[PDB]
PDB file of C-alpha atoms in Angstrom:
ATOM      1  CA  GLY A  18      -4.476  19.265  -4.879  1.00 53.39           C
ATOM      2  CA  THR A  19      -5.980  18.457  -8.216  1.00 51.17           C
ATOM      3  CA  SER A  20      -2.904  18.095 -10.529  1.00 49.68           C
ATOM      4  CA  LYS A  21      -2.426  14.362 -10.325  1.00 49.40           C
ATOM      5  CA  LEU A  22      -6.234  13.924 -10.844  1.00 48.34           C
ATOM      6  CA  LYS A  23      -6.144  16.151 -13.940  1.00 49.07           C
ATOM      7  CA  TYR A  24      -3.034  14.017 -15.212  1.00 49.55           C
ATOM      8  CA  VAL A  25      -4.966  10.701 -14.843  1.00 48.60           C
ATOM      9  CA  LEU A  26      -7.955  12.196 -16.611  1.00 47.77           C
ATOM     10  CA  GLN A  27      -5.931  13.596 -19.503  1.00 46.06           C
ATOM     11  CA  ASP A  28      -7.353  12.117 -22.765  1.00 45.68           C
ATOM     12  CA  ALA A  29      -9.419   9.549 -20.803  1.00 45.83           C
ATOM     13  CA  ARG A  30     -12.652   7.883 -21.901  1.00 46.73           C
ATOM     14  CA  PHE A  31     -15.684   8.018 -19.386  1.00 45.25           C
ATOM     15  CA  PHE A  32     -18.570   5.544 -18.738  1.00 44.21           C
ATOM     16  CA  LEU A  33     -21.760   5.921 -16.803  1.00 43.99           C
ATOM     17  CA  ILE A  34     -22.258   2.786 -14.651  1.00 48.25           C
ATOM     18  CA  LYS A  35     -25.742   2.180 -13.190  1.00 45.91           C
ATOM     19  CA  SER A  36     -26.134  -0.166 -10.265  1.00 46.09           C
ATOM     20  CA  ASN A  37     -29.703  -1.150  -9.113  1.00 46.72           C
ATOM     21  CA  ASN A  38     -28.404  -1.451  -5.362  1.00 47.72           C
ATOM     22  CA  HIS A  39     -25.863   0.036  -3.020  1.00 48.11           C
ATOM     23  CA  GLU A  40     -24.511  -3.536  -2.143  1.00 47.57           C
ATOM     24  CA  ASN A  41     -22.949  -4.029  -5.465  1.00 51.50           C
ATOM     25  CA  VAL A  42     -21.171  -0.613  -5.314  1.00 51.19           C
ATOM     26  CA  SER A  43     -19.975  -1.308  -1.853  1.00 51.72           C
ATOM     27  CA  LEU A  44     -18.408  -4.683  -3.010  1.00 52.94           C
ATOM     28  CA  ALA A  45     -16.795  -2.931  -5.840  1.00 55.68           C
ATOM     29  CA  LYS A  46     -15.369  -0.261  -3.475  1.00 57.89           C
ATOM     30  CA  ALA A  47     -14.124  -3.019  -1.168  1.00 59.13           C
ATOM     31  CA  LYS A  48     -12.701  -5.472  -3.714  1.00 61.37           C
ATOM     32  CA  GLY A  49     -11.617  -3.217  -6.484  1.00 63.18           C
ATOM     33  CA  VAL A  50     -13.735  -5.183  -9.165  1.00 62.31           C
ATOM     34  CA  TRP A  51     -16.643  -4.591 -11.421  1.00 58.20           C
ATOM     35  CA  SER A  52     -18.667  -6.825 -13.739  1.00 56.42           C
ATOM     36  CA  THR A  53     -21.248  -5.946 -16.448  1.00 55.83           C
ATOM     37  CA  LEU A  54     -23.560  -7.337 -19.086  1.00 54.63           C
ATOM     38  CA  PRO A  55     -21.789  -8.742 -22.325  1.00 53.99           C
ATOM     39  CA  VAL A  56     -22.781  -5.683 -24.428  1.00 50.50           C
ATOM     40  CA  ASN A  57     -21.069  -3.287 -22.040  1.00 47.59           C
ATOM     41  CA  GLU A  58     -18.127  -5.765 -21.234  1.00 45.45           C
ATOM     42  CA  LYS A  59     -17.364  -5.650 -24.925  1.00 44.10           C
ATOM     43  CA  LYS A  60     -17.494  -1.968 -25.032  1.00 44.43           C
ATOM     44  CA  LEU A  61     -15.207  -1.494 -22.038  1.00 44.14           C
ATOM     45  CA  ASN A  62     -12.634  -4.061 -23.265  1.00 46.17           C
ATOM     46  CA  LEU A  63     -12.247  -2.049 -26.503  1.00 43.80           C
ATOM     47  CA  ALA A  64     -12.070   1.163 -24.697  1.00 43.17           C
ATOM     48  CA  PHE A  65      -9.237  -0.194 -22.323  1.00 45.02           C
ATOM     49  CA  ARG A  66      -7.054  -0.890 -25.349  1.00 41.79           C
ATOM     50  CA  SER A  67      -7.961   2.446 -26.877  1.00 41.92           C
ATOM     51  CA  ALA A  68      -7.118   5.154 -24.231  1.00 39.13           C
ATOM     52  CA  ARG A  69      -4.581   5.997 -21.419  1.00 41.14           C
ATOM     53  CA  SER A  70      -7.364   5.768 -18.941  1.00 39.22           C
ATOM     54  CA  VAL A  71     -10.959   4.427 -18.968  1.00 38.73           C
ATOM     55  CA  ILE A  72     -13.077   5.958 -15.962  1.00 43.70           C
ATOM     56  CA  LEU A  73     -16.183   4.313 -14.713  1.00 45.60           C
ATOM     57  CA  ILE A  74     -18.550   6.857 -12.846  1.00 44.81           C
ATOM     58  CA  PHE A  75     -21.047   4.919 -10.552  1.00 45.79           C
ATOM     59  CA  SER A  76     -24.602   5.856  -9.795  1.00 45.33           C
ATOM     60  CA  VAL A  77     -27.006   3.708  -7.814  1.00 45.75           C
ATOM     61  CA  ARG A  78     -30.543   3.705  -9.169  1.00 48.70           C
ATOM     62  CA  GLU A  79     -33.005   6.061  -7.430  1.00 48.02           C
ATOM     63  CA  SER A  80     -30.227   7.341  -5.130  1.00 50.78           C
ATOM     64  CA  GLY A  81     -30.085  10.742  -6.683  1.00 48.98           C
ATOM     65  CA  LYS A  82     -26.329  10.700  -6.616  1.00 51.37           C
ATOM     66  CA  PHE A  83     -23.085   9.478  -8.037  1.00 51.71           C
ATOM     67  CA  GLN A  84     -21.104   7.286  -5.531  1.00 50.62           C
ATOM     68  CA  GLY A  85     -17.672   7.866  -6.953  1.00 52.76           C
ATOM     69  CA  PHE A  86     -15.450   6.951 -10.004  1.00 51.41           C
ATOM     70  CA  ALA A  87     -12.686   4.479 -10.700  1.00 51.07           C
ATOM     71  CA  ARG A  88     -10.029   3.659 -13.415  1.00 50.89           C
ATOM     72  CA  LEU A  89      -9.998   0.327 -15.327  1.00 47.99           C
ATOM     73  CA  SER A  90      -6.771  -1.469 -14.458  1.00 46.42           C
ATOM     74  CA  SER A  91      -7.500  -4.573 -16.528  1.00 48.85           C
ATOM     75  CA  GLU A  92      -9.662  -5.954 -19.292  1.00 45.78           C
ATOM     76  CA  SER A  93     -12.309  -8.365 -18.112  1.00 47.42           C
ATOM     77  CA  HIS A  94     -11.282 -11.986 -17.044  1.00 47.36           C
ATOM     78  CA  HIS A  95     -13.010 -15.050 -15.881  1.00 48.97           C
ATOM     79  CA  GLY A  97     -10.949 -15.313  -9.348  1.00 50.92           C
ATOM     80  CA  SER A  98     -13.427 -16.542  -6.613  1.00 52.99           C
ATOM     81  CA  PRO A  99     -17.057 -15.773  -7.371  1.00 54.37           C
ATOM     82  CA  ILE A 100     -18.275 -12.318  -6.300  1.00 52.57           C
ATOM     83  CA  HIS A 101     -21.517 -12.351  -4.209  1.00 52.25           C
ATOM     84  CA  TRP A 102     -23.239  -9.719  -6.409  1.00 56.73           C
ATOM     85  CA  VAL A 103     -26.816  -9.034  -5.750  1.00 57.88           C
ATOM     86  CA  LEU A 104     -28.621  -9.782  -8.962  1.00 54.69           C
ATOM     87  CA  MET A 112     -25.392 -13.912 -17.465  1.00 54.11           C
ATOM     88  CA  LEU A 113     -22.511 -11.643 -16.089  1.00 57.12           C
ATOM     89  CA  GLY A 114     -19.324 -11.768 -17.882  1.00 59.04           C
ATOM     90  CA  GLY A 115     -15.790 -11.389 -16.777  1.00 58.59           C
ATOM     91  CA  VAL A 116     -14.399  -9.289 -13.961  1.00 57.22           C
ATOM     92  CA  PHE A 117     -12.632  -6.077 -14.536  1.00 51.88           C
ATOM     93  CA  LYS A 118     -10.087  -4.798 -11.990  1.00 52.14           C
ATOM     94  CA  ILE A 119     -10.495  -1.163 -11.073  1.00 49.77           C
ATOM     95  CA  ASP A 120      -8.519   1.355  -9.019  1.00 51.14           C
ATOM     96  CA  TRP A 121     -10.718   3.764  -7.240  1.00 50.69           C
ATOM     97  CA  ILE A 122     -10.009   7.456  -7.722  1.00 50.98           C
ATOM     98  CA  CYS A 123     -12.870   8.924  -5.564  1.00 51.50           C
ATOM     99  CA  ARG A 124     -15.141   6.952  -3.090  1.00 50.97           C
ATOM    100  CA  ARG A 125     -17.023  10.119  -2.275  1.00 55.60           C
ATOM    101  CA  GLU A 126     -20.677  10.892  -3.322  1.00 56.11           C
ATOM    102  CA  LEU A 127     -21.831  13.699  -5.650  1.00 55.27           C
ATOM    103  CA  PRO A 128     -25.388  14.675  -5.676  1.00 55.58           C
ATOM    104  CA  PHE A 129     -27.117  15.107  -9.192  1.00 55.86           C
ATOM    105  CA  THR A 130     -28.070  18.726  -8.079  1.00 55.69           C
ATOM    106  CA  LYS A 131     -24.348  19.585  -8.392  1.00 54.86           C
ATOM    107  CA  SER A 132     -24.040  18.294 -11.924  1.00 52.73           C
ATOM    108  CA  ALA A 133     -27.104  20.014 -13.549  1.00 48.96           C
ATOM    109  CA  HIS A 134     -24.954  22.340 -15.658  1.00 47.81           C
ATOM    110  CA  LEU A 135     -23.195  19.387 -17.430  1.00 46.74           C
ATOM    111  CA  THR A 136     -24.704  17.842 -20.530  1.00 50.79           C
ATOM    112  CA  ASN A 137     -23.403  14.830 -22.403  1.00 47.98           C
ATOM    113  CA  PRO A 138     -23.238  15.216 -26.230  1.00 50.50           C
ATOM    114  CA  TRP A 139     -23.109  11.446 -26.677  1.00 46.67           C
ATOM    115  CA  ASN A 140     -26.709  11.196 -25.072  1.00 48.01           C
ATOM    116  CA  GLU A 141     -28.416  14.051 -26.924  1.00 47.66           C
ATOM    117  CA  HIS A 142     -26.967  16.598 -24.610  1.00 47.33           C
ATOM    118  CA  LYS A 143     -29.305  15.372 -21.784  1.00 48.76           C
ATOM    119  CA  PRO A 144     -27.939  16.136 -18.253  1.00 50.22           C
ATOM    120  CA  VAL A 145     -24.897  13.753 -17.577  1.00 51.23           C
ATOM    121  CA  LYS A 146     -26.914  12.005 -14.836  1.00 55.82           C
ATOM    122  CA  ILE A 147     -29.260  10.656 -17.504  1.00 55.78           C
ATOM    123  CA  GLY A 148     -28.196   7.537 -19.286  1.00 56.08           C
ATOM    124  CA  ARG A 149     -28.422   3.897 -19.541  1.00 58.58           C
ATOM    125  CA  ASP A 150     -25.886   1.635 -17.931  1.00 59.74           C
ATOM    126  CA  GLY A 151     -22.646   1.839 -20.083  1.00 61.52           C
ATOM    127  CA  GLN A 152     -23.362   5.200 -21.689  1.00 60.11           C
ATOM    128  CA  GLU A 153     -20.231   6.854 -22.830  1.00 63.10           C
ATOM    129  CA  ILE A 154     -19.634  10.397 -21.611  1.00 63.31           C
ATOM    130  CA  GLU A 155     -17.845  12.714 -23.875  1.00 63.91           C
ATOM    131  CA  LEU A 156     -14.323  13.819 -22.690  1.00 65.15           C
ATOM    132  CA  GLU A 157     -15.066  17.400 -21.740  1.00 65.25           C
ATOM    133  CA  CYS A 158     -18.267  16.547 -19.802  1.00 66.68           C
ATOM    134  CA  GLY A 159     -16.672  13.560 -18.164  1.00 61.53           C
ATOM    135  CA  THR A 160     -13.579  15.561 -16.990  1.00 61.81           C
ATOM    136  CA  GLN A 161     -15.726  18.292 -15.608  1.00 60.89           C
ATOM    137  CA  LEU A 162     -17.975  15.809 -13.825  1.00 62.35           C
ATOM    138  CA  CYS A 163     -14.995  13.975 -12.178  1.00 61.07           C
ATOM    139  CA  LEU A 164     -13.509  17.391 -11.044  1.00 59.21           C
ATOM    140  CA  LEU A 165     -16.810  18.213  -9.391  1.00 58.07           C
ATOM    141  CA  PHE A 166     -16.479  15.284  -6.760  1.00 59.49           C
ATOM    142  CA  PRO A 167     -15.151  16.199  -3.352  1.00 58.02           C
ATOM    143  CA  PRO A 168     -11.495  15.274  -3.067  1.00 58.05           C
ATOM    144  CA  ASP A 169     -10.834  11.833  -1.516  1.00 61.28           C
ATOM    145  CA  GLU A 170      -7.928  12.386   0.677  1.00 62.37           C
ATOM    146  CA  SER A 171      -7.713   8.573   1.443  1.00 61.90           C
ATOM    147  CA  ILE A 172      -6.400   7.965  -2.166  1.00 59.33           C
ATOM    148  CA  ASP A 173      -2.795   8.430  -3.388  1.00 57.97           C
ATOM    149  CA  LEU A 174      -2.855   8.762  -7.121  1.00 59.03           C
ATOM    150  CA  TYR A 175       0.827   8.104  -7.368  1.00 57.77           C
ATOM    151  CA  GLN A 176      -0.105   4.415  -7.453  1.00 58.22           C
ATOM    152  CA  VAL A 177      -2.624   5.000 -10.214  1.00 56.81           C
ATOM    153  CA  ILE A 178      -0.115   7.128 -12.343  1.00 56.33           C
ATOM    154  CA  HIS A 179       2.368   4.386 -12.324  1.00 54.92           C
ATOM    155  CA  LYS A 180       0.197   2.005 -14.202  1.00 57.76           C
ATOM    156  CA  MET A 181      -0.618   4.177 -17.207  1.00 57.61           C
TER     157      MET A 181
END
């Protein structure tokens, strides 16, 4: 069902993450980690202290889709080097909530007030998505039956 998902998303903050290749999102899905440029790292660390959940919604450049979304489980920290394909800051630990794709064609009815009400697919890496738009976007994703949100709920 969708009840534990709605609980995790209650009063959450949402951020659009843009990756220039699939390899980096694949590594993030495998290792439960993300890294970003200092301007966004500072924003995400502030957000992590400020909200019950911070949700990263991933989109690979030119793919026409989102590739899933995840919850920050830590602030950034400086583990073994991650062989990202590229100045990069600390590593955030993340817990995936959905590893399934969502095509942009399915989110065309959602506009982001924090980016001039442009369609939510439009945005620079790190763009915040307002609460209502972000919640509706996450709920559009196909359910990911491989994930048990009981584990995620325990960390909040």
